[model samples]
Target: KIEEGKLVIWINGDKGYNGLAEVGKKFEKDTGIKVTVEHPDKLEEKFPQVGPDIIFWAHDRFGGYAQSGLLAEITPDKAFQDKLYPFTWDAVRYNGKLIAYPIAVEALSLIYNKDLLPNPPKTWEEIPALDKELKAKGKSALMFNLQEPYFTWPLIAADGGYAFKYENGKYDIKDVGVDNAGAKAGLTFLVDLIKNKHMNADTDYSIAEAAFNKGETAMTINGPWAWSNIDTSKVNYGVTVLPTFKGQPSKPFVGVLSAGINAASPNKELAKEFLENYLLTDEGLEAVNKDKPLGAVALKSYEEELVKDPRIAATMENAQKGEIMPNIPQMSAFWYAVRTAVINAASGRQTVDEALKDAQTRIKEALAVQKFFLEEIQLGEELLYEKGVDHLTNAIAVCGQPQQLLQVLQQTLPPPVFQMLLTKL
Candidate 1:
């Protein structure tokens, strides 16, 4: 009779969900609740309609879901909280509220073939000299996904650059910092590498990974996700934190895989029990690692045991040198704009400064559109009245008053539109 009660869990249709079925089996035996694991094509798209009791997904997506009131807030007791790493807590939060339980933390780093280069370069300047040595042997020194902005973000963030400024313990999305001096300096180093023929803009993830595996390249920047593709028999590789430019650290964005409960679920209590007492435990994590070890999770005891594995140790080492990915709705805007900027810079379509400036402009416009939807339209007439302006004037004022926002619109919007807003203000 107890088996009649069922709990559905949504997991991504990816390799990370491999061993979770076994974990779900144990949960069924312990709680006498039948567990159904569903592999969804797109969790974010299908989540609301399907309404699974629990969801297993990346933490960065939590902000958008949580802000939309799709996720339930989780309040873990002190004992449970103490078991996890401090940084992992931030990973599971959205605007200071806990929305998920962090399962794994990951960040990109330099993974190099030891046979090609026994001593890896510790700084950006050293990479060029090493590349010169490798070029003589028909090999390249360093190669990465040149068109992807995420991998290059560490270099941009090297000297105090950020997507959004952190103020009062929260990210101020309005204060876009992509065009700051630090970002320009960092991106300039990357652009110079391309111009000097150290690496080509045509190199992408697959190309770089294949080159490194075949010993055509000495090193490549990657994450633990790329480990499965490595032919360990042919190449002895080592993973290290990303090298510095000048004296500053190349701080990559740290992403966490986490679990959350659906706000609409009737089995919230059971879902919490499964997360707090079952899946987050040492045994559950062991099962997860058994399929294929990804990286360290939140629990200290599990992490301590995980670090004994060389790959996991390297992942944690890199993560310690990186900054956690911001779980805010504005982050979605960051990705599209930043990707465009990187592609432009890498392909010589635009200079570094010009590319980054364009990124800031695009993000500002996207977020402004989002704000208008969320604040003005969603709240309707009440919000407009509160602002002491009609809908037209309110929209105009929204684009004009905030100086930073105004500057972006001034650069990006059509002349007639910009003029209309200015006249209304």
Candidate 2:
């Protein structure tokens, strides 16, 4: 059914995959299996028909792929899994099964202006003192996207807060953990900091980055993606793992970019060998990193070896203590719900307890409605109809009336999703 000596690997974009061209040639030379690499406009469209032996994408997309039965399980032994940072393996797993081979990871860390803060604070207690010192110099100590939960989630994590708990190798959604005691304390910590002038509440990413770039702030919490925005000439900055707080590490979310085998591919064995024996090795990883230099590769030995680059070193330091962002689809609800709570608490509109409790209730209600629609809507109907009574009828069948469905979904769905869904009717 397939060519004996050829295999196709599909990549999502140009920037990273452009680097893999050399790796593909080397793989062909070593194994005599010709590797054909492609970058399709939209991978989801051509994924099945192309039947690529390998596919590369974000770990977050693994759930949807696995749910569609498009991903093949590839369980590596402890020796192999141990080579990767613990969170990398967690990102690649789907219900306890290894669904991908992790390549590189990304996480947020503290970036400080080297000249301004030669000695960055290593603990939470140090921050207030540092803030006072900075304020005396007419500058802020730290800044980040206060209105967005993704940037602030690490603060909650410092106190053992989590959106969902993984139990028996699966995310236990029913046991949502965001409103736990630790979460309230963590949120309170931020609120106190804002109230006491240690940090700002109205800051967004643009304002935070602008302040840091112009040397108005000594330090900021951001990820590698923000690196290009800073004026290097004006601000000589260094990155480090986030500081500890209240005896707990500031464990940010680590997102993995991974490679997986297509379930329907004819070259399954070849793909597995290429990933495990060839691509994951130190030499192979080096080839992959040579072009774009993805930070913190999966192999521990390789990561340590590659730490020659300061950015990778900082990312590795964070990855050592980072938590994997759960790949489950339900995380869509968690983001909106938690973000609202974060903004409310940070803005002093609600007490930490009230905001967190509200977040928990909203997430639970959203998930319930999501489950209902997922079951009730006819398969592919949402995609097929631009405007139809059938869509309204589908909602009526599930919720007894279109208006009731609108009210239920209005509270749960994000603006974009709610608008998109309503547009069909």
Candidate 3:
């Protein structure tokens, strides 16, 4: 169906190319459309050349682009949606509109070496005691990336604090639950792990992973990528959802990688056919399961096989419990603030209260920079109009993005009548 001859797709890096190549070959043979795939050293080289069709670089390197409108809109038919698992679909939805065909999803979990500490501790209180026992046995309690706040996010969430909330189609960046008493208790607990030297904070991803592989550390938290090289038989290995802090289970950010179409693709229809028949099929799921086991987001047909393998089952559960990372433009600003607050908590420079307070200030500033014309629009009687306009403008001034600002505007702006303002403005 491509009137323009061939479809030239760009896969981000070398690791992604091999697996996608298998799927591409099958797609080419079944659809009779020529497929050209490239794993360039610089994928950013293909950005301006984007639409006319291209596969997104899996890591969300082009996330800013996709959120900002540099990429094309993708609306798939029911047959395509049916091929994917429900969580996969949930990952791709931004404000309830599908943006991509999610191929893989992963989440953070606690991976522990059972040989060093036979039974995983059941609660936060047990960890300190467990760490002391491991130390007496000449073993370190844990290893992790202290420089990255994502390592600490679950700890905060488990203690009853959350980073962001989605309300009425837009994520509210308010500090409502972040400074809760439980959150502070969680942060204090993490500090104890570090202060007592029970966990190594200097360890980076490669370092922690290497330590885990060699059994240098008894427990560590990591994503699914750590599974392949683990020596399962030498040491008993177990993967579990992050254990709770006072019975509140930790919820990590769900990481999802999806395939999207180029808005400018001449092969749009052919590409659609290829995406449906190959990438979203049962055969496609099997291919994905084989090629990238850690990233498979296929349906339940593979569930029994997955659960039989502890590693894969834990990964599926991780995805289920995770909250999706937002794809909105303003989300970038929030991430920077959250990262800083977490590091502040990590270094003992700020209490959870002070950290969340700092984060709220930064979020307000981020929104202030992205404000627009709707800042002054209003409706209703004169006195109400003044209050309504002031409240609405302040909300938009705080949220920044039009879509985000519009969400607050709808409730406060008054419906049917505000519809007139929307039309007139």
Candidate 4:
């Protein structure tokens, strides 16, 4: 039920504009709902004065729109609910409502120069020896941002540590995993890398990219955005999943790009349908490929496409073991703690152990009064169902009869059902 005539779309950047506009053109041709795309760089300043029908941007930017309630809520629409990948759905689902559609997927990986050293180590076990070997060969091994915390998440997760405890579909920041011994073990390797001069500290993406491109450094971690910019001719460029430091493979957060329909658009239903049908279309996937040739969120069939590209393959393989990004409103606060800890550790301002402990304390204090609950958990009497979801792993108490404890269970028990239960009793 698309409205007659044109649907004008304004994008954010020229690079982003071209791809989004192309997709819109294709959608218009297919469905005959005239589509137009625009990129107004000054939209942020002009949006309030002249609000567009829809806005397009990244999640970090959209967060501002969400908080101000200038956006529409989409959870109420049944048709719209059926049109997203579970991961993408979760990405936009805030406070039990959908905010936007995910457009493309991007993930960071450890990039290395194979020319300097052949057969680079794949795990933490091999890293220490390699660091020594790199020194012997007059080369350094790794580099990362000292001021940014997002960079070190892989090491922490690899060591059997998570930022927060996830219980029965709910997460509590107070139960921090940063202070765990496993995380400390991973950080130890990082500190050792710094001490050995095998890693460049307090540097940023630009310096790391330049250093790697010029073959000045052996390896660094970054994402798909660097693809168009890096010089790979002088060195045998290689990108792979970040190596695990203490236990299993390192798991980094995947920053996926998605298409979000403006919840408050005048033609909301039509816009959603167009996006729904378009995302699974060839044009939609191609638009994403033009920007990020390495990743796709909707197409499971694109595994061959990924495997063909070494960079894409690395991120995909890494993602097979990665945790899905929680689209919770509390995510901003969560990253603050994560980033601050890493910055402190990398800058020599604080030791890894001290920084992580400080992060735990800080995050716990921030979330002290924050309510952590699952939408599936419901409310009132159903809140009691928490016990069932809890399923204590190492409890020593008696295995009490849960059925007998709830009076609601008794009312449902008919004579025959009660006889059957009595036989078990």
Best by lDDT: 2
In order of appearance, the predictions have TM-scores of 0.82, 0.86, 0.76, 0.71
Q: Identify the runs in model 1 with alpha carbons over 4 angstroms from their true place.
A: 1-6, 15-18, 166-169, 347-349, 372-425
Query: Which scores higher on lDDT, 2 or 4?
Result: 2
Q: Across residues 1-425, which tens digit of lDDT does each residue of candidate 2 receive?
A: 24655778877774466567667788789888898878888885677566578888878888778877889998676688788777677888788788889988889989999988999988866888889989999998998899888889888878789988976557888988889988888888889889999887889998899999999999999988788777464689999878887888888888888998888877888888788887788877777677666777888889888887787788877866876888788899999999999989988899999999999999998888767666555442454533433454465555545676678656653566567666565
Per-residue lDDT tens digits for candidate 4, residues 1-425, read 21335566656663456666677777778777777776677865555455555565554455556656655665334644444345545545444456776654556687888887566667856766776777787666665554465667777777766765644434454566777887777776676666666675657867777777777777778876676666544567788877766558887765655444554467776676666667445557667567635264445544455567778777766655555454445566667876877767766799888988887776765554333222212332242433322212111012244443334534643455434434443
lDDT of 3 by residue, 22-122 (tens): 77788878767777767666665556554336674443344555555655556678765675677666655555455566766678888999778777876
Better of 1 and 4 by TM-score: 1
lDDT-best of 1 and 2 = 2
Best of the two (1, 2) by TM-score = 2
TM-score of model number 3: 0.76
Candidates ranked, most accurate by TM-score first: 2, 1, 3, 4
Looking at model 4, residue 155 earns an lDDT score of 75
> With candidate 4 superimposed using the best TM-score fit, by how many Å does residue 100's alpha carbon deviate from the native?
3.2
Which is the leading candidate under TM-score? 2
Off by over 4 Å in 2: 1-4, 44-51, 376-394, 397-425
Model 4 lDDT-worst window of ten: 389-398
